[PDB]
Amino acid sequence: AWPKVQPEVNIGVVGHVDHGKTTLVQAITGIWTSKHSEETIKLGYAETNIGVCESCKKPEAYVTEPSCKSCGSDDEPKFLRRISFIDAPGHEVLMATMLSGAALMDGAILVVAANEPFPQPQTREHFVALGIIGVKNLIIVQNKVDVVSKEEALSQYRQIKQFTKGTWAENVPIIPVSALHKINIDSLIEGIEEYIKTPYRDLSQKPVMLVIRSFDVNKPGTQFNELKGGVIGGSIIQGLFKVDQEIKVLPGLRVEKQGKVSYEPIFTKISSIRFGDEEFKEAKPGGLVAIGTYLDPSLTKADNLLGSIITLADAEVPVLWNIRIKYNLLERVVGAKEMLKVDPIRAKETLMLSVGSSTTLGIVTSVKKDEIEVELRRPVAVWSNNIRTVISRQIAGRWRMIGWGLVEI
């Protein structure tokens, strides 16, 4: 038998909308992401086990369920790992969610339609977005190869391989498939194993989890004495959490008093840990977890806590209202139909910073070549110095990434 274990890695599936992201995840997992249930946790999210048939031949040997029959064995295949997929379906340019999901990803798949000319505009943007959020274990999937000749396909392979020449993606593998008719889906599973390894985990590190959702899971009609603590859900970036640990939510609760706004950490205990509809006793990185608490539900209702981080109660985690960022910029942003150039940061101009799952707004109080300082509209929990942030500006009525950087403390 295969063990029931949580997902150990997140892989984001992204690409120009309509190019087949949602279908591809379904080909692999057997689940359809928009929408799914339930659950809640939004986005697209789907998990699958991944296994190998030792007797049989690769790629065909790879399997997402515990049977080797397809290669001729009644033998049980070797369990490799459980993985999860996160894809943001539908409307794009809407992503402060690409930034949330950004910090969840241990690697990505960029879906490229084969019956359409490459790069499309949203396809170039996603390729830069990926560099900015610094997720570099990347497989490029050439989808819909079934609608075009081996030849039209190799042509696009040429174009893609060329377009990544000189880039950090120069050696990123390109895998042809049909998500809709399920062709060569095994080559892809092989590639995922080869090109997106579960990262080193250090379990001694201080537990930290980004909150991407919060619910009140009590159904209407629920008797008061049967009520359930608020549920927070999100993904653990480091350390591990255990049922019954004491934890706190940062920045936490927000106070008026009555004209001067501050933030108080929110303290509570972990009542339960769920991955999918599986309960567990611990939560490590990878996958999206649902943490039950002893919190008054009105605290977690309707994603109130979105953007928070969760640490253990006695953890030491600065909450700052001003931050120093060592930053790089892009020379040009894809912009309108034409390439656009980014002005250097100017004093007092307001910016959008994504830290972890937080998207928070700030006014730039100092600017130099490699560093800037911003006054934040809302404080951010900085759980370490390595923390990557994504600077974005207001360009044409819509917020758009102009570069990235490291928060310094």
Ligand SMILES: Nc1nc2c(ncn2[C@@H]2O[C@H](COP(=O)(O)OP(=O)(O)NP(=O)(O)O)[C@@H](O)[C@H]2O)c(=O)[nH]1
């Ligand atoms: N650990 C834990 N997770 C829970 C619990 N109840 C629900 N979850 C998790 O929360 C999600 C399910 O939310 P759901 O039951 O749909 O609540 P809801 O319908 O959104 N709330 P509402 O009806 O108020 O809109 C899943 O991720 C599930 O695993 C619980 O008691 N403990």
Ligand SMILES: Nc1nc2c(ncn2[C@@H]2O[C@H](COP(=O)(O)OP(=O)(O)O)[C@@H](O)[C@H]2O)c(=O)[nH]1
């Ligand atoms: N022929 C063909 N059609 C596909 C393939 N993948 C997706 N589609 C179709 O493309 C349309 C939108 O694809 P979808 O999975 O929703 O991509 P998304 O919008 O990026 O999430 C749907 O009608 C799918 O049936 C494929 O591999 N081959």
